Ligand SMILES: *[C@@H]1O[C@H](CO)[C@@H](O[C@@H]2O[C@H](CO)[C@@H](O)[C@H](O)[C@H]2NC(C)=O)[C@H](O)[C@H]1NC(C)=O
Ligand SMILES: *[C@@H]1O[C@H](CO)[C@@H](O[C@@H]2O[C@H](CO)[C@@H](O)[C@H](O)[C@H]2NC(C)=O)[C@H](O)[C@H]1NC(C)=O
Ligand SMILES: *[C@@H]1O[C@H](CO)[C@@H](O[C@@H]2O[C@H](CO)[C@@H](O)[C@H](O)[C@H]2NC(C)=O)[C@H](O)[C@H]1NC(C)=O
């Protein structure tokens with residue numbers, strides 16, 4: 001239950017090979033979350049590959065009216 | 072129109088629900104009050120510090136000692152409390168500067184996104200901006216941005232220009248697409264295929280300079296009229 | 300454009316006192332300054348990470364470039380990531396890192412940033428792939444692929460020039476763009492003052508810290524600058540007066556440092572807001588504002604990471 005990070009030494013949490021969104025920022029790309037208490041490397045986002053080619057295009061066929069809030 | 076109105080009503084209902092349900096949405100306004108209250112409380116707490124003297128009570132120092140060293144003790148107390156007040160004033164000045172910058176940004180947003188339509192990306196909401204509405208809030212303003220978002224995309228095969236009778240045709244306002252057999256010209260942000268004619272296309276040079284040009288015919292509207 | 304400054308931290312009693320212990324006992328009666336300093340420095344440290352997140356984390360998808368890097372004669376090898384190097388960085392990014400550059404822990408420390416350099420590089424690569432393979436549509440909804448010459452035709456139509464101008468002169472424009480990229484690389488390599496701002500930020504922080512650690516060696520009007528010598532020399536009734544003067548002087552210096560740090564953090568936050576606006580408007584779309592995204596009629600732009608900052612290629 002002892003982990004060594006660039007920030008320092010962590011006691012009480014176990015490292016997990018999985019990745020999730022950062023909840024409690026620890027540092028050097030390491031975050032902590034509760035589910036026992038686990039520590040992991042935060043995930044940047046969902047990976048996506050676009051189908052680019054020399055002569056192909058994509059055109060929308062529908063729309064959505066969205067409302068957002070800004071404080 | 073009817074579908075747009077229904078979507079707008081559903082969106083505003085969802086906004087009301089989200090505001091009613093999420094407690095952390097209004098953290099920005101809460102933080103100003105929280106910072107000010109804690110700063111003022113810390114200023115109050117500073118009053119009960121000895122600042123290196125024997126006692127933290129002024130009149131106690133007056134009564135329990137003669138003027139000679141009581142003067143030194145009071146000098147120390149006054150210097151400490153004046154320094155604390157100066158620190159608080161500096162903190163208030165910095166916070167006021169930051170708040171003024173935020174207020175200028177809010178004024179610009181009100182003048183641009185509300186009183187008109189802005190073409191700046193992401194300045195007035197995520198997506199293509201349509202309009203916005205202002206609302207008041209304790210020491211703040213809340214903007215509701217109504218915006219347009221494309222969806223349900225479809226793949227197509229495209230060509231830059233059309234070679235016809237040794238002439239190169241380019242779209243005037245749209246783009247050339249094809250489902251696999253026939254070719255159409257459609258607007259950029261919405262699928263609306265149309266028969267390619269000489270009114271929505273313009274001619275420039277021959278078809279031996281552009282790369283990727285394809286072969287197809289271009290219908291002429293005046294040809295049937297002259298035929299009869 | 301600089302984005303974030305170095306996250307710093309201080310230990311109150313270690314600096315204000317020395318290795319002695321009853322010095323801390325005297326310190327306990329001077330007030331609760333340590334809470335103020337810890338709170339302010341924690342606020343600055345979290346503001347740095349907030350600035351970085353605002354500047355870079357603008358897309359929720361990590362796009363990837365197609366394996367075949369052919370875009371109708373356009374050459375993007377100079378900005379795209381290089382798999383050969385272990386760090387997975389563009390040559391321009393490597394040059395930027397190489398062009399930008401003791402350990403006396405007397406209470407002073409340096410908290411590492413939350414986002415490592417690799418994650419920032421990955422964000423930049425995702426942004427480059429999105430703006431290359433899908434134009435600007437990825438910044439306002441789902442990503443829609445478009446051939447690159449067609450996208451350049453749309454941009455020329457946006458700047459008020461017909462599409463045939465591009466479509467008749469594709470090779471010449473591609474050659475000009477490649478030559479311009481090469482000249483940019485050479486100019487960045489051969490100019491010492493090109494990267495002045497980030498180096499100035501680093502120098503400011505380091506010099507302020509060194510000045511703080513140097514001010515500890517002043518007597519401040521006391522008989523000696525060594526607290527343990529004073530305690531081992533005088534009767535505590537007047538050693539108290541001596542050490543009171545010393546503690547007040549050191550506290551005043553530390554307060555001055557905190558104020559300077561706050562002002563610099565505010566300025567850096569303003570610069571980070573400007574950089575975020577530039578990234579939002581010049582990269583994810585085309586802007587008609589004059590001189591905002593380069594001199595002349597703006598066509599496009601590309602982001603690159605740098606130590607505590609960003610570099611835009613317009
Ligand atoms: C465009 O999308 C909208 C919704 O995003 C579609 O409207 C829905 O259509 C389905 C099927 O007819 C209905 O069951 C829903 O009730 C509709 N939604 C609403 C809010 O009325 C619309 O049909 C789509 N347009 C096209 C041409 O596919
Ligand atoms: C591509 O679009 C064209 C134009 O709509 C299609 O041709 C017509 O399709 C309609 C709908 O099935 C038919 O009623 C017409 O008789 C077709 N006209 C001709 C001249 O064939 C064409 O089928 C579409 N191609 C594909 C693969 O969907
Ligand atoms: C489009 O049509 C033109 C003319 O119908 C084609 O040009 C001819 O191509 C053949 C085959 O290579 C040559 O033998 C002729 O000399 C060409 N004539 C002219 C006037 O250029 C052209 O190849 C067609 N393009 C496609 C893609 O089918």
Ligand SMILES: *[C@@H]1O[C@H](CO)[C@@H](O[C@@H]2O[C@H](CO)[C@@H](O)[C@H](O)[C@H]2NC(C)=O)[C@H](O)[C@H]1NC(C)=O
Nearest residue numbers: 368369370372373374375376377390477480481
């Ligand atoms: C794109 O540009 C790069 C350099 O800007 C080209 O890479 C050069 O390739 C030649 C021949 O293969 C080498 O002699 C050079 O040393 C390379 N330069 C560098 C910096 O490595 C590349 O060939 C160009 N074309 C493509 C398709 O990538």
Ligand SMILES: *[C@@H]1O[C@H](CO)[C@@H](O)[C@H](O)[C@H]1NC(C)=O
Nearest residue numbers: 052053054055283367369371
């Ligand atoms: C078609 O795409 C391939 C790679 O996807 C490319 O090598 C080729 O040049 C393209 N065709 C044309 C005419 O550009």
